[PDB]
Design a protein around this nucleic acid. Structure first.
Lengths: 151, 192, 257, 191, 66, 192, 50, 50, 54
RNA sequence: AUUUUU
RNA sequence: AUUUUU
């Protein structure tokens, strides 16, 4: 939203594999895994709307609190024709293989960099969608019991 | 060199056809594939090659046990729910918990409940009391593909125990598949 | 097929109706300087995506080597980089006389000790990363006059040992990288310890990866007149250092499960 | 070296980390600001150690001398309906010192980017080490500073938004910390 | 002449001011996936004209022999 | 052929890097370079190779004259104000207007006012009364570059006249530079 | 401005070298000169204005 | 001295070239310089002291 | 390679004869000779070649 | 530093 | 259907 300050947060939360439909299935199947994770933010605005948004990610972070992303893996998004920016998170754990359901993937934060601008015939706020998938180096290892029941 | 497309800047409406193994990079990073085991545990043949519990039946008489075999929404086999169609060998693991007797086991994709009344040629393997067998039922289906979801996606299993005295018991059944052919992956399932 | 032909449909026409004085008109068509392109720039763990880029600028006949050819600073160009691996004083305790054998003189939290204070060369970087993988090079120094005698056991104890320390038999600690150093003979001990743990990486600011200790092999036999204040100092250098996981400033992050 | 790469990153990640691109400033382009008006400035080079949350803040504290190159990316986004132009220019200490003595409109002589809004959303500036001394004292405003002026005020239509933000990002093309010193203690490299 | 040079005026500069640790920045410029093109499709006695086309999609390793 | 860019149609935001010698044309026109003199008067070496008044000092005693040399905001030397840094030889022209005596002249970039109290090795050239000399002071600066603006951009000049009787006078000083190295041109100056 | 008639004037004046910061410096340094002069008008409008 | 603690200071001061006889001469002669400086501490103890 | 003698560890009583141009090093350091002028100002002929008041 | 001149 | 394994 245009109202959101040039530093306020538009979205913040701790990311887990289970937060993703496709992945959550593997989470309930395999016990461990490894590889990079890719998140793709798709902001659906009009051809008139313009602005920037920086989304960072602190690997294995647990404290759900807004924090400067200058040192975090971030991606600045400048609205244009291709309004679907991505961000990759290289495998990061103390082990060669990590729990598919255990420690968080990290802190995901999308802060406002430049207020969403608009005009008389354009929206003052737009909708955004965050998707997630595994990298080309993704792997899963041990199959374990189930933690949930699908339908 | 690297294009801006491979650096994160893309368009969601230009993803078709389905299945684009596009590489993603940035300075100080590149897709690194490191293996821990001598083989993959993600391959359909390997993963599903491992059984999983299905259901249990407690018998008292010599009656027959007819049950619509289906894919699990419970164990690691749930990964099948990501697909729409299946076809291939089916491994059925049966445990005959009985003091003294025999267990007739058979399998068919035929929906008719009368072609089973006899068990003539439906695969009547014999597991002696207190024993257990693993029979691999072929794709004797009348349908080229098995919708993976159907309450009878997998063919029906038959169990007519041949008891001798007042002896009774229970038949626990678990199963896996041999080389599975899955097609047209559908959206991920929901949770209960 | 049209919409650009403006150049050769005006440049030619005149070239066709020109007299000795030459053409009376010239027309050229092309693409604007501001074209429909997208630029992407990536710095360390960052990616800037711009869909409305502009021609980058820079000073006149610039030199980006950034190296001072006069070396007004006589040091190695990679000084700042290697600085954190520099040798530093990790500890200095006093060998209190009358301390039976086996008694622990002093210990040192490995590897978080290299960031012991904000005055440690490695303290700076260590704060911007949660994961660490490094090798050590210790130099325990103990000086004692010739008249006196004694011996101390400088040994490295991985987390496994530190955890179950009381369950281990002293006198067998010689199985671990150590240096039975006989005073009045040696004034310093050298220990090269590689990354040792049951996990690929160790959480920064953690006691994991074990810790270096100094025990009393044989108590100090200090003659009457001889001095009685022996100091034991532990110095540490990083044979190789590696900070990977990014994180907020000095915030406890769990790399473990 | 972990042969399993439990940490998928470049081995020299920690080393290069301080040269990483960072947000140096973000001010709001207050409408009704005449031409020449200074939108926002930035203390060069001490701004890269602006807060203890800056990747370069760590090392910068253990060295008194610095010699580095810059790569700025001033970003300003404005809807299509609106128009305007800003002057992103680098001003060495000499300029910053005698700023009032210089004629605006001539600042185009310095590495700049007259960037016309509604046309460009970001400006790029590659600035090498520029000073009258081989090295600059760490934590100093020397080596100049980057500024953003109002070339032509914002012409914001009635319905259009009126809160334009100007952001300044910075990356170190090349960094060099030499003189050792106590933790963040003012040391004079100059005479 | 300008307005695209963003890639080799940033990719080179670093390549010119790089140390043993290599360049500290890489920049690449190109055309957007959504370019200014027009698509035309004709079926039996029909013609569909679209000036805002998108990348056509299809199932995994599909067989259209039918 | 000629592009529309070279015909006037351009974009101000695409001028970087600084220094684009782009040609501008239109029918019946082309950049014509015609020379009137055998050499350039725009070259830094030539222009600045010509002195310009600096300041004058009226002496009465044998005292010393210390003055911060700086670039002019007054004569043709003002063209230097378009630059930020300087380095190179410095030509100092001194006129010793006196009836009977000698004038000691020296130059240093050293800011300390005590290293000049003596004049040991600061270049004590001697201009006899009523004479004038042009000494070229080397770049004996402790700073690689001289901000061109500083009230002491150029090093300090020393003048300790050695008079004989009650004689007094005045020392007019003007100056130029030999081969000047200017860098990083800054915006044009304002007027008073 | 939109109001300005299709023939009215938006700007008119006599040009001298001294009217330019950079040039005015040379004007105060050199006595004569020659060569062509280039003037660049930059109108800052929105993408809708025509 | 033996008394001095294991961290106490035995000597501290700001160093200038003039603090050295030989160098102080050059300090009074030349205005500038460059290069590395070498300081050599010579502790005169007995063969028993450690 | 470098000996401990050239790393700072020496003996003051072993300096004779007078005039030992021994090199001193440590990691990340080496004697760097950089010239600013075309000639020396330390040479006796040059320095003294310049007068001084008497 | 053809950063005196060719 | 190296859709047991190489």
């Amino acid at each position: 939203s245009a109202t959101t300050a040039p530093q306020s947060i538009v979205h913040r939360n701790i990311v887990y594999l289970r937060l993703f439909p496709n992945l959550n299935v593997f989470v309930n199947s395999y016990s461990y895994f490894r590889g990079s994770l890719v998140l793709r933010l798709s902001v659906y605005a009009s051809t008139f709307n313009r602005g920037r948004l920086r989304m960072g990610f602190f690997p294995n972070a647990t404290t759900d609190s807004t924090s400067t992303l200058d040192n975090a893996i971030y991606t600045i998004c400048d609205i244009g024709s291709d309004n679907s920016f991505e961000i990759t998170i290289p495998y990061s754990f103390s082990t060669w293989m990590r729990k598919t359901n255990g420690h968080p993937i990290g802190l995901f934060q999308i802060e406002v960099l430049n207020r969403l601008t608009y005009n008389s015939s354009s929206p003052s706020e737009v909708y955004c969608i965050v998707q997630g998938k595994m990298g080309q180096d993704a792997r899963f290892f041990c199959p374990t019991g189930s933690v949930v029941t699908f339908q | 060199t690297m294009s801006p497309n491979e650096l994160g800047l893309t368009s969601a409406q230009d993803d078709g056809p389905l299945g684009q193994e596009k590489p993603n990079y940035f300075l100080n990073f590149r897709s690194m594939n490191v293996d821990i085991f001598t083989v993959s545990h993600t391959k359909v043949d390997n993963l599903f090659g491992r059984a999983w519990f299905f259901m249990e039946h407690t018998f008292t008489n010599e009656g027959q046990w007819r049950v619509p075999l289906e894919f699990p929404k419970q164990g690691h086999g749930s990964l099948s729910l990501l697909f729409a169609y299946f076809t291939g060998e089916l491994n059925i693991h049966v445990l005959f918990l009985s003091e003294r007797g025999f267990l007739r086991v058979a399998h068919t994709y035929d929906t008719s409940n009368d072609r089973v009344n006899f068990l003539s040629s439906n695969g009547v393997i014999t597991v002696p009391a207190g024993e257990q067998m693993t029979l691999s039922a072929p794709y004797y289906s009348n349908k080229p593909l098995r919708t993976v979801r159907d309450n009878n996606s997998l063919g029906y299993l038959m169990c007519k125990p041949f008891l001798t005295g007042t002896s009774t018991g229970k038949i626990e059944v678990y199963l896996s598949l041999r080389c599975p052919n899955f097609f047209f992956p559908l959206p991920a399932p929901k949770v209960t | 097929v049209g919409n650009e032909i403006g150049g050769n449909l005006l440049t030619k026409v005149a070239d066709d109706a020109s007299n000795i004085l030459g053409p009376n008109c010239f027309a050229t068509t092309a693409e604007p300087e501001n074209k429909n392109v997208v630029q992407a720039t990536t710095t360390v763990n960052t990616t800037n995506l711009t869909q409305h880029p502009s021609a980058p600028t820079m000073p006149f006949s610039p030199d980006f080597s950034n190296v001072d050819n006069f070396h007004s600073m006589a040091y190695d160009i990679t000084t700042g980089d290697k600085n954190p691996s520099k040798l530093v004083r990790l500890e200095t305790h006093e060998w209190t006389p009358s301390w039976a054998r086996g008694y622990q003189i002093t210990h040192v939290e490995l590897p978080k000790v290299f960031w012991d204070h904000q005055d440690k060369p490695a303290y700076g970087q260590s704060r911007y990363f949660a994961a660490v993988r490094c090798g050590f090079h210790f130099q325990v120094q103990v000086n004692v006059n010739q008249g006196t005698a004694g011996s101390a056991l400088v040994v490295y104890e991985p987390k496994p040992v530190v955890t179950y320390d009381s369950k281990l038999e002293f006198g067998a600690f010689t199985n671990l990288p150590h240096v039975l150093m006989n005073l009045a003979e040696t004034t310093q001990a050298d220990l090269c310890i590689p990354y040792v743990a049951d996990t690929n990486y160790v959480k920064t600011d953690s006691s994991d990866l074990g810790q270096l200790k100094v025990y009393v092999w044989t108590p100090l036999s200090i003659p009457t007149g001889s001095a009685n204040q022996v100091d034991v100092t532990i110095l540490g250098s990083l044979l190789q250092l590696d900070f990977q996981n990014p994180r907020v400033f000095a915030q406890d992050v769990n790399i473990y499960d």
